[PDB]
PDB file of C-alpha atoms and ligand atoms in Angstrom:
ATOM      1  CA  UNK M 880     131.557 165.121 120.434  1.00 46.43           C
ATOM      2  CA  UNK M 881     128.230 165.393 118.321  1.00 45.48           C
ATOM      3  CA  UNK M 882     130.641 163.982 115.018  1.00 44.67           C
ATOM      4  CA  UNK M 883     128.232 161.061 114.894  1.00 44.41           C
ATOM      5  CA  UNK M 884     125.456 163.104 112.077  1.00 49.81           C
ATOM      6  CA  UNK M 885     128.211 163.144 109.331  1.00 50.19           C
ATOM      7  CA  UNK M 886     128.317 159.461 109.510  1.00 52.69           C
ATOM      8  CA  UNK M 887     129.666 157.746 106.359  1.00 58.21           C
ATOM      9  CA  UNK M 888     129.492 153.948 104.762  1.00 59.21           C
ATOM     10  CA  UNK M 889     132.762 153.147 104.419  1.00 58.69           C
ATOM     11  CA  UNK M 890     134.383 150.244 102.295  1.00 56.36           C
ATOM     12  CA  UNK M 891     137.506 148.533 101.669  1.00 52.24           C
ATOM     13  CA  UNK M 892     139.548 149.291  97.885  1.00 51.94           C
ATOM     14  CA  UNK M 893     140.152 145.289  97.024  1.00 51.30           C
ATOM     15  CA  UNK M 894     142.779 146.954  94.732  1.00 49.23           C
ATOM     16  CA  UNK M 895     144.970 148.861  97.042  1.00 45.96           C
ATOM     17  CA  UNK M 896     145.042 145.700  99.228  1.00 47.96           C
ATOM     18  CA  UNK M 897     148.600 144.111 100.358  1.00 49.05           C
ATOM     19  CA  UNK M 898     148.836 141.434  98.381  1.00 49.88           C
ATOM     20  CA  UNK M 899     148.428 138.567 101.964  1.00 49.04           C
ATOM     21  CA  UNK M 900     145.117 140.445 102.967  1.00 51.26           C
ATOM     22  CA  UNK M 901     141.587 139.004 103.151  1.00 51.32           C
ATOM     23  CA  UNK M 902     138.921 141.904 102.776  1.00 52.44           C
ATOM     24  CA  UNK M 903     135.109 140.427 103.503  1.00 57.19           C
ATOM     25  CA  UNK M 904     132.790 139.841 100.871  1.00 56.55           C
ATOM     26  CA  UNK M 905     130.922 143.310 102.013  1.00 58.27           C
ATOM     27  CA  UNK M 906     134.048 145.712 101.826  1.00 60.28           C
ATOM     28  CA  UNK M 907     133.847 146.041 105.765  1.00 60.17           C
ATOM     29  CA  UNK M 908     136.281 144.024 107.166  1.00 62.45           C
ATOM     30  CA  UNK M 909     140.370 143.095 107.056  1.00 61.16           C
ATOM     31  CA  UNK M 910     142.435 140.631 108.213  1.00 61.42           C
ATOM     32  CA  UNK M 911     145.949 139.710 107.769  1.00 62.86           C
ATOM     33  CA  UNK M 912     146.022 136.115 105.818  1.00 63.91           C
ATOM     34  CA  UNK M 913     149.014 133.610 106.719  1.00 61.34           C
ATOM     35  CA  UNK M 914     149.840 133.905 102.621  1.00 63.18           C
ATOM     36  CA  UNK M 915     149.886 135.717  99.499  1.00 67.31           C
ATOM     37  CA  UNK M 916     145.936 135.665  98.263  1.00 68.30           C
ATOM     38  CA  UNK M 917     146.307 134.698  94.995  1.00 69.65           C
ATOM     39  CA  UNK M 918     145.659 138.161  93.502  1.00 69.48           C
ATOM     40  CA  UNK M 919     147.570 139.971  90.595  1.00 69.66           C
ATOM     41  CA  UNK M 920     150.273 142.353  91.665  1.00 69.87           C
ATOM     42  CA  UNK M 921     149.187 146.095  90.599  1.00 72.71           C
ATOM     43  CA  UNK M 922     150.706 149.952  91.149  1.00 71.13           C
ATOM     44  CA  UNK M 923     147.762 150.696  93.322  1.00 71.75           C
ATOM     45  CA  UNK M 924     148.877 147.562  95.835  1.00 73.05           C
ATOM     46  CA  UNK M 925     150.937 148.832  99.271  1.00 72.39           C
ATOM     47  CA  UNK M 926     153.569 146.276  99.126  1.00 73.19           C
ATOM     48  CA  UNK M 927     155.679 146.566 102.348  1.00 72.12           C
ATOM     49  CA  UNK M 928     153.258 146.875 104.645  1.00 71.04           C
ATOM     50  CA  UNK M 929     149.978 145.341 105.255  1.00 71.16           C
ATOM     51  CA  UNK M 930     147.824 148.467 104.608  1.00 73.60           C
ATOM     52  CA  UNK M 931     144.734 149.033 102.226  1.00 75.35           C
ATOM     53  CA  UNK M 932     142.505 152.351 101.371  1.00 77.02           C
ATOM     54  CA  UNK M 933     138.805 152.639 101.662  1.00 75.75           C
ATOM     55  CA  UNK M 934     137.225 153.228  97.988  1.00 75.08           C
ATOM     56  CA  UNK M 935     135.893 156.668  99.222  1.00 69.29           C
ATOM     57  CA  UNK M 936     137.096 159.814  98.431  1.00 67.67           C
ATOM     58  CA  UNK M 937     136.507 163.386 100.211  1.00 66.34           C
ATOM     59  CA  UNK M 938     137.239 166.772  99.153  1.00 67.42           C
ATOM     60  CA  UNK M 939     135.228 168.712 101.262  1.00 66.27           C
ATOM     61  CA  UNK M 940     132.744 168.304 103.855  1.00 68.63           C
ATOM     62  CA  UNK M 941     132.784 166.571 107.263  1.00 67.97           C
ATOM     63  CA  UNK M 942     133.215 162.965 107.935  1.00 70.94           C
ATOM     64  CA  UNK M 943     132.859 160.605 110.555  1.00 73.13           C
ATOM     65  CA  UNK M 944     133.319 156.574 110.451  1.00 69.88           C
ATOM     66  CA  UNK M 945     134.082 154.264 113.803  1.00 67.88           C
ATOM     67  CA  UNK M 946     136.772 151.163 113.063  1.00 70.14           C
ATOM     68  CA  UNK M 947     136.743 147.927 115.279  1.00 70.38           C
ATOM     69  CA  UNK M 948     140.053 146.896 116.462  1.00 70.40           C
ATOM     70  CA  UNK M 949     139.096 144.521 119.616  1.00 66.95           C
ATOM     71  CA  UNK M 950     142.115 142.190 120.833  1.00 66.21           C
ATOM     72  CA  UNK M 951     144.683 143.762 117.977  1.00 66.47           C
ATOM     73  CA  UNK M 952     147.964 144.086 119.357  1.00 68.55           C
ATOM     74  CA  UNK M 953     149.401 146.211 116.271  1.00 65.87           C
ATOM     75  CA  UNK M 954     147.425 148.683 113.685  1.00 61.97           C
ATOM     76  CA  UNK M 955     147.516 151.885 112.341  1.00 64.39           C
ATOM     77  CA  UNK M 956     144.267 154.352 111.076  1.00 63.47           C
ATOM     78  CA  UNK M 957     143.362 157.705 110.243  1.00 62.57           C
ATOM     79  CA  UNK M 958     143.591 159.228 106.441  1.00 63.13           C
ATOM     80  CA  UNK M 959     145.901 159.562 103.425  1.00 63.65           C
ATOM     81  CA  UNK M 960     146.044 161.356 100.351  1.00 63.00           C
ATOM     82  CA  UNK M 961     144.944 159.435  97.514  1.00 65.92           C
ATOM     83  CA  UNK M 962     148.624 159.920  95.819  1.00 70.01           C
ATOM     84  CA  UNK M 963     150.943 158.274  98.889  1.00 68.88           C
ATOM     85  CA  UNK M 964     153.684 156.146  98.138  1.00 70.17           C
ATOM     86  CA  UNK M 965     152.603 152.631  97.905  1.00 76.38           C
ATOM     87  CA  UNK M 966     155.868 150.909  96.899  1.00 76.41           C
ATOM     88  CA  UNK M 967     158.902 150.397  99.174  1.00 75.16           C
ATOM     89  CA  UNK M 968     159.789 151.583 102.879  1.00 74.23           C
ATOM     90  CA  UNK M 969     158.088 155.047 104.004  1.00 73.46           C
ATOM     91  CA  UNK M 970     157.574 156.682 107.765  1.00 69.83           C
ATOM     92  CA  UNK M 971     153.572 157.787 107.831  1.00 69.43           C
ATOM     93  CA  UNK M 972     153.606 161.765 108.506  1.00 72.11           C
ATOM     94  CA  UNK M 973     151.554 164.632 107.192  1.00 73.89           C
ATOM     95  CA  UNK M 974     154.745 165.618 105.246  1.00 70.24           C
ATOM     96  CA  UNK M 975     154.108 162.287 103.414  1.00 75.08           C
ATOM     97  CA  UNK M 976     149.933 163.004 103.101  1.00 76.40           C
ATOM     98  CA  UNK M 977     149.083 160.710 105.943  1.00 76.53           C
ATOM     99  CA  UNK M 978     147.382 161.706 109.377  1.00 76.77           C
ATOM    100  CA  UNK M 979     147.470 158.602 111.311  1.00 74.74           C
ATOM    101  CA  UNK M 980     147.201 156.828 115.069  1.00 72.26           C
ATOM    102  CA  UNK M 981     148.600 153.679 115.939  1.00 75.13           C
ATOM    103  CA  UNK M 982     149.342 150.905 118.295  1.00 79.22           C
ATOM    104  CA  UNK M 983     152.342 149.546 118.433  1.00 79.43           C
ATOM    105  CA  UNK M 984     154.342 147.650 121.492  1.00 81.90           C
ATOM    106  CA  UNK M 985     151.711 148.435 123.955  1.00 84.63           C
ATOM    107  CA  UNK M 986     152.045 151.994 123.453  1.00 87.25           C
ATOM    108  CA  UNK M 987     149.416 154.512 121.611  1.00 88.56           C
ATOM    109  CA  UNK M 988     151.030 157.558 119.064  1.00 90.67           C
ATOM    110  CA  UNK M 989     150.271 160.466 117.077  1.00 86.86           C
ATOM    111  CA  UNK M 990     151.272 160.474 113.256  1.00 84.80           C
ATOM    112  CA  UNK M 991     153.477 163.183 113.830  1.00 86.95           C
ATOM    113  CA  UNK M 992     157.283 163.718 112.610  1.00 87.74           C
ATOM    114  CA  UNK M 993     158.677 163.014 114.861  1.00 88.10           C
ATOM    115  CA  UNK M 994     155.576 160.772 116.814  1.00 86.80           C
ATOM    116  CA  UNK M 995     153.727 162.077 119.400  1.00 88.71           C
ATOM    117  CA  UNK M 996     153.195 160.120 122.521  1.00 86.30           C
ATOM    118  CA  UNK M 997     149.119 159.868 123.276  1.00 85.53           C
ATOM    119  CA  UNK M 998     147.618 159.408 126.929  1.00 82.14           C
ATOM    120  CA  UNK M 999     145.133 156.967 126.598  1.00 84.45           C
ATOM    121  CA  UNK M1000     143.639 155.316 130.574  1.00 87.07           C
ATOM    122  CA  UNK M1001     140.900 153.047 128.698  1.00 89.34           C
ATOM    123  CA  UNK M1002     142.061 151.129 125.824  1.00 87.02           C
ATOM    124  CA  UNK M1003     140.013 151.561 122.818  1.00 84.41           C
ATOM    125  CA  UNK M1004     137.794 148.955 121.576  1.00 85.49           C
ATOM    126  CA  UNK M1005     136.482 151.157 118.559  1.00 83.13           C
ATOM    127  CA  UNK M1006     138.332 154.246 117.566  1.00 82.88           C
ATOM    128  CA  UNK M1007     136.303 157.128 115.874  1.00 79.01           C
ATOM    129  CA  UNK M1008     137.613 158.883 113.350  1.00 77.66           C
ATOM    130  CA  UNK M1009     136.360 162.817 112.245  1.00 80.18           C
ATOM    131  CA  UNK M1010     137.232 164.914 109.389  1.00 78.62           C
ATOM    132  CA  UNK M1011     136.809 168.356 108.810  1.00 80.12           C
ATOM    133  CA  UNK M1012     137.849 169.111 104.986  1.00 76.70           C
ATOM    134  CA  UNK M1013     137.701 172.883 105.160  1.00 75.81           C
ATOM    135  CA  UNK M1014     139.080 173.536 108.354  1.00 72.54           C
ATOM    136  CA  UNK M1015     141.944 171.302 107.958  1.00 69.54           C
ATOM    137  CA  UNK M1016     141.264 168.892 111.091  1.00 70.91           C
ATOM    138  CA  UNK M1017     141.342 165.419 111.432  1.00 73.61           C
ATOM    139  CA  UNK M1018     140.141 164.010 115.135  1.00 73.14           C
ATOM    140  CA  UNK M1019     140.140 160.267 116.954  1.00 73.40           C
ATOM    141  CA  UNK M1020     137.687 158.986 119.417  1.00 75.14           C
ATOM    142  CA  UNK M1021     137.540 156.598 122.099  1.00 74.62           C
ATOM    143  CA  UNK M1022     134.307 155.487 121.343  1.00 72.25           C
ATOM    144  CA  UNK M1023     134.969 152.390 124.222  1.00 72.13           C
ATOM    145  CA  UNK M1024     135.363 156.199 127.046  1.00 68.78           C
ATOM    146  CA  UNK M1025     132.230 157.778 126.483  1.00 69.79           C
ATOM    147  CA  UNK M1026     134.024 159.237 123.118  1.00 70.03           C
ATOM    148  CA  UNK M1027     136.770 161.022 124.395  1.00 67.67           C
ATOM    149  CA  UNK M1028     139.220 162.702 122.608  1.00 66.60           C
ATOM    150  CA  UNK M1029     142.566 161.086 121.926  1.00 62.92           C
ATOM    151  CA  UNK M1030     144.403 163.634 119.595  1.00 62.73           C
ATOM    152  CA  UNK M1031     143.529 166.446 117.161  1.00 63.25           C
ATOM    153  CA  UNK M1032     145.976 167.056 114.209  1.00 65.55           C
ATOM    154  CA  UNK M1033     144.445 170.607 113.172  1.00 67.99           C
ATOM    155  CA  UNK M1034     146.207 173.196 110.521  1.00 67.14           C
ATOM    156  CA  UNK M1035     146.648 170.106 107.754  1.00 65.25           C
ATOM    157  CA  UNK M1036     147.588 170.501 104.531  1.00 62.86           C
ATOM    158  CA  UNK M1037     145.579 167.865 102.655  1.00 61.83           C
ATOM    159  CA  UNK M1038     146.566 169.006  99.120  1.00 62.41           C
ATOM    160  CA  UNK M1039     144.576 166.473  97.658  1.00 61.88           C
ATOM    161  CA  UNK M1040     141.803 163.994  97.230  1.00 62.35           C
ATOM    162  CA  UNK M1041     141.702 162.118 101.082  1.00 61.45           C
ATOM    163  CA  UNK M1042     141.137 158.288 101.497  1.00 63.39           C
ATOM    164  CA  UNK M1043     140.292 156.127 104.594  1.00 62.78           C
ATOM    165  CA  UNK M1044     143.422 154.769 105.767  1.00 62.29           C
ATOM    166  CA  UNK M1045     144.031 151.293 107.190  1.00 62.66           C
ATOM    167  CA  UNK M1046     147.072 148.981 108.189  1.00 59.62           C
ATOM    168  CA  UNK M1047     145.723 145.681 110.237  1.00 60.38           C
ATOM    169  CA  UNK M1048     149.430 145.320 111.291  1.00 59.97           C
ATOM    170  CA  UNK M1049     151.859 142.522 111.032  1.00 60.21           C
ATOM    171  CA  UNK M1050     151.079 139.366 113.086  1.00 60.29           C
ATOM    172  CA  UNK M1051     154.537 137.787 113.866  1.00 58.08           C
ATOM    173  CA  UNK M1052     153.456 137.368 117.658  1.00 59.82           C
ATOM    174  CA  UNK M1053     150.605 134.692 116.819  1.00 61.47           C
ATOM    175  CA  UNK M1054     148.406 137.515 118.969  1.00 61.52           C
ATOM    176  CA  UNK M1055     147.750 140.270 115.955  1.00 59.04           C
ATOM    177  CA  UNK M1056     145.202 137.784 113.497  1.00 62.29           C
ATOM    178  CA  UNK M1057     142.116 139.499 114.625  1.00 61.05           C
ATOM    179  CA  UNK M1058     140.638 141.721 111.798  1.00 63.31           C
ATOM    180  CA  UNK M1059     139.984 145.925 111.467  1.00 64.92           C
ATOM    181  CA  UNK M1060     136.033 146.440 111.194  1.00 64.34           C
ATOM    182  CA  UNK M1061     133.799 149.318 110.104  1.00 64.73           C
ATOM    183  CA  UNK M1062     131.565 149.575 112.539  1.00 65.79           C
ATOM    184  CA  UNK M1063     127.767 150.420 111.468  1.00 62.76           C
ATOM    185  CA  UNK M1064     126.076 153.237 111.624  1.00 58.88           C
TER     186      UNK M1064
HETATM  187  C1  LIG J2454     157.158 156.673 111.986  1.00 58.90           C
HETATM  188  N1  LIG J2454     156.718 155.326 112.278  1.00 58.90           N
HETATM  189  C2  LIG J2454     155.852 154.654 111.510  1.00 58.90           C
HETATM  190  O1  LIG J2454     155.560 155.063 110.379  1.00 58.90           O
HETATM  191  C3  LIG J2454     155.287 153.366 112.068  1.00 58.90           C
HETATM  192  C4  LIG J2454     153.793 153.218 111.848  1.00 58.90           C
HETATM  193  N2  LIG J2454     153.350 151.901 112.335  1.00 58.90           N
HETATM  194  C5  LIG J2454     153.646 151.749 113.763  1.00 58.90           C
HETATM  195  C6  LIG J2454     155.099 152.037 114.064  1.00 58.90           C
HETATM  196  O2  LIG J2454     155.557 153.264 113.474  1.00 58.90           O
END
């Protein structure tokens, strides 16, 4: 993949933030605190789940960013639309505006309804994440193999405003407390 030219500065919505997160002073990195942080609650706030947007928003064009997510045992990435659900329980699909990978239970899936079961031999280290606005394609990258492809959700349906999607992932194991990063350009 030659994604890497539509490169994009990506940073973390304070706002959106579950109310237990801890985003870094420069908007690049989350972690999962072992509290509430002390913030007012708001409508933009996802409040089951530990899950915050990047202040960005795309309408067009192509995209690329590259996310961190060394030693995590649990987390979910890709895109949303801007107007997703924040409050209560919800499954993360396109039919809900989110096109999404994850880890979860030593296992690596597709966003898909129902989820789709990815093949991964080299665990990812950094994940790369490509968007295509007009052709209706979002792609991840194992940036850790040489950049190879892990999954392609093509013929989307954005309807809407897309943001950068994050969930750092519950940490009731004691083994999840490591943080998502943007990685630089
Ligand atoms: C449909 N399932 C989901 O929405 C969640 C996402 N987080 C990892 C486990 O599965």
């Amino acid at each position: 993949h030659h994604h890497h030219h539509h490169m994009v500065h990506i940073t973390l919505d304070r706002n959106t933030a579950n109310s237990w997160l801890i985003i870094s002073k420069d908007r690049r990195q989350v972690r999962m605190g072992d509290t509430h942080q002390n913030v007012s609650d708001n409508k933009e706030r996802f409040s089951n789940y530990p899950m915050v947007l990047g202040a960005q928003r795309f309408s067009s064009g192509k995209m690329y960013w590259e996310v961190d997510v060394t030693q995590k045992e649990a987390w979910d990435l890709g895109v949303c639309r801007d107007s997703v659900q924040r409050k209560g329980q919800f499954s993360l699909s396109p039919e809900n505006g989110f096109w999404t990978i994850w880890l979860w239970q030593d296992s690596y899936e597709a966003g898909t309804s129902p989820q789709t079961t990815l093949h991964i031999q080299v665990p990812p280290c950094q994940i790369g994440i490509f968007v295509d606005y007009e052709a209706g394609v979002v792609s991840f990258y194992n940036i850790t193999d040489h950049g190879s492809l892990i999954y392609t959700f093509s013929e989307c349906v954005f309807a809407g405003p897309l943001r950068p999607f994050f969930n750092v992932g519950f940490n009731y194991s004691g083994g999840n407390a490591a943080p998502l990063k943007l990685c630089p350009l």
